[PDB]
Amino acid sequence: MSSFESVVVIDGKGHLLGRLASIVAKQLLSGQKIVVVRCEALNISGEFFRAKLKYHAYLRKMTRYNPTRGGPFHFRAPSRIFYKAVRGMIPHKTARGAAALERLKVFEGVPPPYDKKKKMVVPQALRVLRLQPGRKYCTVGRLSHEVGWKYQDVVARLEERRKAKGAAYYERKKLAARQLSEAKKAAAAKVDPKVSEALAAYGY
Amino acid sequence: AEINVEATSWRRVEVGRVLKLENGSLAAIVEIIDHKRVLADGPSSDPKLATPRGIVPLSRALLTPIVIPKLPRGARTGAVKKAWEAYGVDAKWKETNWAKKQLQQERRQSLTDFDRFKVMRLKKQRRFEERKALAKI
Amino acid sequence: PSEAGHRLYVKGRHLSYQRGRRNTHPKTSLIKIEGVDDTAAANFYLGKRVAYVYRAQKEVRGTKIRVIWGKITRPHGNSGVVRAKFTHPLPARSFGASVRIMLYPSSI
Amino acid sequence: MRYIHSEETIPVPENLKVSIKSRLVTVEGPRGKLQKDLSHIAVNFSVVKKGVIGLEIHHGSRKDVAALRTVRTIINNMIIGVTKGFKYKMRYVYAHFPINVNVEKNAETGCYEVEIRNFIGEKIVRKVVMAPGVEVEISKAQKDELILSGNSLEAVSQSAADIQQICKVRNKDIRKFLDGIYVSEKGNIV
Amino acid sequence: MGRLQEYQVIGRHLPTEANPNPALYRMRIFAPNEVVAKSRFWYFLRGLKKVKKATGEIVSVNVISEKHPLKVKNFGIWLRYDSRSGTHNMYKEYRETSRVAAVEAMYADMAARHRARFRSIHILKVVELEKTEDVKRPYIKQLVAKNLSFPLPHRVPKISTKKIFSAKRPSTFS
Amino acid sequence: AGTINKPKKPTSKRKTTRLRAKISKRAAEKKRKERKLARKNPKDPGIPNLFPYKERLLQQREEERIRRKEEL
Amino acid sequence: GSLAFLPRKRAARHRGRVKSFPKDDPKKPVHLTAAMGYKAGMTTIVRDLDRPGAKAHKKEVVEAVTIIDCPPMVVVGLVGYIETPRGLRSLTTVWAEHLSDEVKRRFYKNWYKSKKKAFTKYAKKYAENNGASITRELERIKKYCTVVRVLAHTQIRKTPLKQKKAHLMEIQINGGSVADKVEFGRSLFEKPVTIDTIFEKDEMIDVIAVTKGHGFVAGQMGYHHRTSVNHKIYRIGKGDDEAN
Amino acid sequence: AKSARASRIKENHQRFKKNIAGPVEAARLERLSAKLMAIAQASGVKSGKSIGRKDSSIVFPM
RNA sequence: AACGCGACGAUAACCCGCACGUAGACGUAUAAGAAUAGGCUCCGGCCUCGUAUCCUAGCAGGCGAUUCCUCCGCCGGCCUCGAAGUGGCCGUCGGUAAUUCGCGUAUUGCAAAGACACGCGCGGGAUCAAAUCCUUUGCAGACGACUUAGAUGUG
C-alpha cells in the first residue's frame, strides 16, 4: 500500500491492456520504475474479432508518400502494442514524457534477469477481478500472431524451459521449507520458555 | 457407479449464519432481504463484538464458518441472544482462526517503541537458537 | 558494526505544482508521501518540515549537496497527497523527485 | 431476472467411472475413456444422490440455465457413448460408374484413412483422414454400405459429415445426377 | 430521489365569509424535505381541483415514521408514469423494511429500466402485503420461497485502490 | 462480409460546430412549427388487475359513492 | 516496373547475401546447403528431350547453358546461432588454424603495406594447449545452438583471374542433430569440399548474383542483388578429366 | 484460370511433393551425405568440457 | 534503422608537462506455476488480509575482554548459468553482541583551505595495429562511390 521500490516487475498475464497501461503511466509520472513481462500474456476485453478489426484499421492507416518518415509504423509485437498504449497515455512529445518512457521497459517472455526476480500484480487491472464471468476476452499474443508477429513459438519454448527450471526451483524450495520447519520445532524444544512467552505476549 | 467431483464448497448464507462486519463485530442473519442485503443482529455481551439489529450488506459482510444450528426466521433480539449464549458463539469465535489473526494484528499495532526494541533483541536470541539447529540439520 | 539504517525522515515524491488544467502555480507544490493514503494521515503530517536535496557539480561549503527547505501545510484531495510551500519553488524538473519529510516539529 | 438457483440432474449407470477435477469431465467405461474440458461455462458440480450428479447455477441468467441444459445433454451423450457407443450406417449409390471405397489403418498416428475412387468417373482419388477413436468397416450384410462405429458422438458425426461433404457434386443438375455417399442409419452399438 | 421522508400534509382553502370552515384536505407525500413536500402538495391540488397556493394555507405537516423499521417486508406499489406516448399504469413489488426505502428502490428501478423521472412518476398507491401468496412477481416470490440458502460465488475481495501493487494474486473464494 | 479483414471508411463521431449549430437552429424551428400547428388547431387506464387488493379498492370506491349519496 | 523491386537500389555487397536457407528437420542425413563458383561464360548444347507430352519429345533440342568455374572450397570455420525472441543471433564462432593467405587478404584491406598479424594470437591459442577454450566453444555450440553454419572460402589462386583475395561465405548444415552437425563441421575443418560433394547431377537449384550495372548511358539502373530461382544443373565437369 | 495460390493447386502440389519428388530427393541427399562423410573422414574446467565464461540495456543502472 | 543488435579478428602502452573529481539510492532486501463455479499442503491440515517474511543494537558505529562457532565478504578448485549469461558447494583468509561487561563520545553551547591514493581528462614526444590519400585495375561509375593489385611474389 503506497510503497516505493527500486523497480517494480509486473507479470502481464491476466491484466487489462488499458487499465494496466494507465496505472503504469501514472507510476512513471510519479517516478517509479516499472518493467512489464508476459506482454504476450496480456489480455484485452471485448471479442477477438473486434480486436482484429481495430488493429487492422490501424494497419489501414498509412501515409501517402514513402512510409519511412512521418508514417505510422505498425509494430506487431505485443510488447510494442503495450508500448503504444502507454505512449498514447504519456505526454510523449515533452521531456517529462520522454523521461517516463525511458523509465518504462517492456519485454516478451521473462528473460533470466527478471525470472530470478519477484513479479507483482495489479488488482485493479486483473481480468478475473475486473471482467464479468460471462464476458468474452482475447489475447494480445494471439492477435499479434495472426496479424504478423513471428516469434510466438520462440517465446513458447523459452517459456516452457523457464517452467521446467522454476519447477526445479520450487522443489528445492520445498526442501528448504522442510528443513526450516524442522529447525523451528527442534530449536523451540529448548527455546528458553521465558523468551518464548515474551514473543507470544508481544505477538511475534 | 463411482463419482469423483471436486468443486468449490462455498459457505451458504442462511438464517443462523454469523458474519463479521468491517468494523470487527459479528452478527447472525435473521432473515434474507435480497441477493445482496440481509437483516442481521449480534446480541453479544462483549462490547467489541456487539452489533445492533439492522440491515447488513453482503458486500461488506464476510462469512464466518460458525452457524447457529436451528435459529428460527424472524427471531427477535431475545431469542437471538438465547441462541447465541446456548451455542456459545463467543467461545467458538475466540477459537476461530480469523480471530487469532485479528488479535495478532491488534497486538502488533499496540506494540510500542521499547516493545519493538525488546522484540528485536528477543527475536535475535530465538533466531540464534534456530540458526544453529538448522545447521545440525 | 551497526549494519543498520540512519533514516530519520519519511520518503516522498514532488509530483507537480498546484495547477488547474492549463494554469500552474509554482509557488506551491504537490507531494506524495510514502505510506499515507488518507486525509487523517495527511492531517498527521500537516505542519511539517520538508527538504529537497540535490547535487550541484560545484562545491561551495566543501560539499555539492544543496537543500531547499519548505513545509507541508494542508492536504490535497482524498488520496493522501499533501501540499507544500517552500522558500524557493521546486525547480520544475523535480516533477517525480525524491523528497524528505522530517519528523519535526513533533506533537507527540 | 437473475434467478437465485437452478439445478439439473444426470443419472449415471452402475458400470462407469466419472471424474471432474477442475472442469475436465473424464468418463471411464468398458470401451474406453472420454475426456472433455468444460472450462468455458460457470457450473457447480456435486453428487446429489448415490448415482446422480447435480449440476447447478447460483445467481445466473436464462442464458446460464440454457448452458446448464446443453452441458447436461453433452454429459449424457458422453455417458451413452461409454455405455453403448455410437454407430452410423452410411450408404453410397451410383448410376453407371461403381464407386470404390477402401479403408486402411494408417499405422503411424494409428488412424483410419478412407479412399474413394470412380466417383462419377473422376480420376481424382478422394482420401479422407478419419477421426481418432472411431472405427470404419465395410459392411458385409448389405452392399454399398459402410459402418462407422465409435465412442465419441461428436467425432463420429463430424467424420460422417466430412465424408458426406467430400462426396459432393459440382456444377451438375442435382435432380438428374444422384450419385454420392449418404447417411442412412444413426444408432447405438447395442 | 435522495433520502426521502414521508410527510402527512393537510392543507385548506383560506377562510371566507361566504364559505367558512373548508374541508381540510390531506395527502401523503414522499419528499426530501418539508418545502418539497408542500410544493408537491400544492401541485397535486392545483392539478386536481381549483384550490391554489395563493388561496390556501397548509395547516399541518407531519412525519410518518415507519411503524417497524426492523422488519423486512413486501410492498406493492401502483404507479402511473408518463412516457412519450402517454400515461401507463404499472404495479411493482419490492422487499424492504420501510415505505421510504421501498419508494427509493422504486424510483431507482424506474429510472434504470424505463428512464422515468421524478416529474414523470406519480406515486398512486403503496401497500404492505399483509399475507404471503399476494406476491405475483417472480423476483420477489423467489426470495419469499421457503428455506432460501444460496452461496455467493466469485466474490471480488475489497483491495484498497491505493495499494497499486500486490505481491500475491487475489483469490475470489470469499 | 469481409469487414473483419478489410475495414472501410470510418464514420467520424467528432461533430463539427457548424453541424451542431445547424441542428440547433433547425430543431428550434421545429419547436416553433409544432407550437404554430398546435395553436392553429383545426380515459383513465384504471386500477391494474394484478393489484392484490383491487377488490378491496372497488369496495372502498362503492362505499365512498354510498356516503356521497347519503351526504347529498 | 514491379513494386517489389523498387526503388532501384545498389547492391550493398558485391558478393551477394543468401538471406534464406532451407528449413531444417533432424531426420535427413547431414549436408551443406550452399556452394560458390565464378561465372565463366555460356555455351550451346543439344539434347535428346525426355519430356513426355511435349511437342519436341525425343528430338534434338538446342539450348544455351551457363558455365560456372567451381574450384574446391576450404572449410575454415564453424558458427553457432541461438534462437531468441528477437530472431536468430550469432552465439559463438570457432576458426581453424593455418588460415590461408587469401582468407587473410579477405580479413585485410591494404595487404601489401600491412605486417601479417591477423589471427596470429588465435593460432597461438590453438597451439599452446588452450584446447580447453577450443572444446569449451565447441561444447557451447553443441549445447546451446540450434543452427550451425560452416565458413567456407573459394580460392582465386586456382581460379584463372587477376584477383588474389579469396571469397568467404557461411553455409548452413542441415539434416541432423546439433551435436551431429557440429561433429561433422569439426571433421570438415581444413579439408577441401568439391561440388561433386555439395551438389549433384541433373538437379534444380537457386542462384544468387548481382546483375550488371549499366553505367555511363531515374537513377541507378543496374547492379542489383538478384536471386534467380529454379535453374537446373545439367552437368558437372571435373577439370582433370580433359574429356569434360 | 485458377490462381497460383489457389487451395486446390496447393493441395495438388503438396500431394506431388509427398508422392513423387520425395523419394528422388531422398535418394539424392542420401548419396550426397554419403560422399560428404567420405570427404569428412578423408579436470573438467581445465580440459574445457564444462562450459565457462568467455575470455546492459535490460536492467536499470544500479 | 545511415542515432537497432550480435559474433569474431587486429589495436594505443610508455616519457615529460597540467586539470578536475545522476529525470534523482539511503534496508532503494523477497523468482513456483496454475485456477479464480478453486487452490495450497508437511497429508496433520491451511487459504479475505504482503497488516507477511528477511533484515534491523555498537563513534556515520571505537578499544579491550566475556563468549560464540552464527552469518558476511575476498580469492582459488569443482561444477554450474546463453532470451539482453551467473549462482551454488567446498577450501583459504579477514571481519563478526547470541550472552555479558569496563572503558572513551561533551563546551559542535536549544536545528540551520593538509598529505597520500585512485581514475576521467587534455599539450607535446615516440610506440604499435590499421585506415585514408597516391599508383594500377574495370566485374563500376553524372560526380562521389565500388571490385582488385602494389613491401620477393602462381608478384
TrEMBL record, chain A:
Q: Which GO terms describe its molecular function?
A: mRNA binding; structural constituent of ribosome
What Gene3D superfamilies does the database record attribute to this sequence? Answer: 6.10.250.3250, Ribosomal protein L13
Q: Which of UniProt's keywords are assigned here?
A: Ribonucleoprotein, Ribosomal protein
Biological process (GO) annotations?
negative regulation of translation; translation
Q: Which Pfam families match?
A: Ribosomal_L13
Cellular component per GO, a single term:
cytosolic large ribosomal subunit
Q: Which PROSITE patterns match?
A: RIBOSOMAL_L13
Write out the function statement from the record. Component of the ribosome, a large ribonucleoprotein complex responsible for the synthesis of proteins in the cell. The small ribosomal subunit (SSU) binds messenger RNAs (mRNAs) and translates the encoded message by selecting cognate aminoacyl-transfer RNA (tRNA) molecules. The large subunit (LSU) contains the ribosomal catalytic site termed the peptidyl transferase center (PTC), which catalyzes the formation of peptide bonds, thereby polymerizing the amino acids delivered by tRNAs into a polypeptide chain.
Q: Which family does it belong to?
A: Belongs to the universal ribosomal protein uL13 family.
Q: What is this protein called?
A: 60S ribosomal protein L16-like protein
Automatic annotation (TrEMBL), chain B:
What CDD domains does the record tag this protein with?
eL14
What are the recorded Gene Ontology BP terms? ribosomal large subunit biogenesis; translation
Provide a GO CC annotation, any one.
cytosolic large ribosomal subunit
Molecular function (GO) terms for this protein are:
RNA binding; structural constituent of ribosome
Pfam families (UniProt xref): Ribosomal_L14e (PF01929)
Q: Boundaries of each Large ribosomal subunit protein eL14 domain copy? A: 52-127
Query: Keywords of this protein's UniProt record, alphabetized?
Result: Ribonucleoprotein, Ribosomal protein
- Entries under PANTHER family matching the protein: 60S RIBOSOMAL PROTEIN L14 (PTHR11127), LARGE RIBOSOMAL SUBUNIT PROTEIN EL14 (PTHR11127:SF2)
Instruction: Identify its protein family.
Output: Belongs to the eukaryotic ribosomal protein eL14 family.
- What is this protein's name? 60S ribosomal protein L14-like protein
TrEMBL record, chain C:
State if Ribosomal protein is listed as a keyword.
yes
TM segment ranges? none
A Gene Ontology cellular component where this protein is annotated is:
ribosome
What the entry lists under Gene3D superfamilies is as follows: translation elongation factor selb, chain A, domain 4
Does this UniProt record's set of keywords contain Protease? no
Gene Ontology MF: a single term: structural constituent of ribosome
The superkingdom of the source organism is Eukaryota
Q: Which GO terms describe its biological process?
A: translation
Q: Which InterPro entries match?
A: Ribosomal_eL33 (IPR001780), Ribosomal_eL33_CS (IPR018266), Ribosomal_eL33_sf (IPR038661), Transl_B-barrel_sf (IPR009000)
Keywords carried by this UniProt record: Ribonucleoprotein, Ribosomal protein
What family, per the record?
Answer: Belongs to the eukaryotic ribosomal protein eL33 family.
Its protein name is 60S ribosomal protein l33-like protein
Q: What is the lineage of its organism?
A: Eukaryota, Fungi, Dikarya, Ascomycota, Pezizomycotina
Automatic annotation (TrEMBL), chain H:
Origin superkingdom:
Eukaryota
Q: Which InterPro entries match?
A: DUF2423 (IPR019434)
Q: Which Pfam families match?
A: YBL028C_N
Q: Enumerate the spans annotated as DUF2423 domain.
A: 1-42
Give positions of region: Disordered.
1-20
User: Cellular component GO terms, alphabetically?
Assistant: preribosome, large subunit precursor
- List the protein's name: DUF2423 domain-containing protein
Organism of origin is Chaetomium thermophilum (strain DSM 1495 / CBS 144.50 / IMI 039719) (Thermochaetoides thermophila)
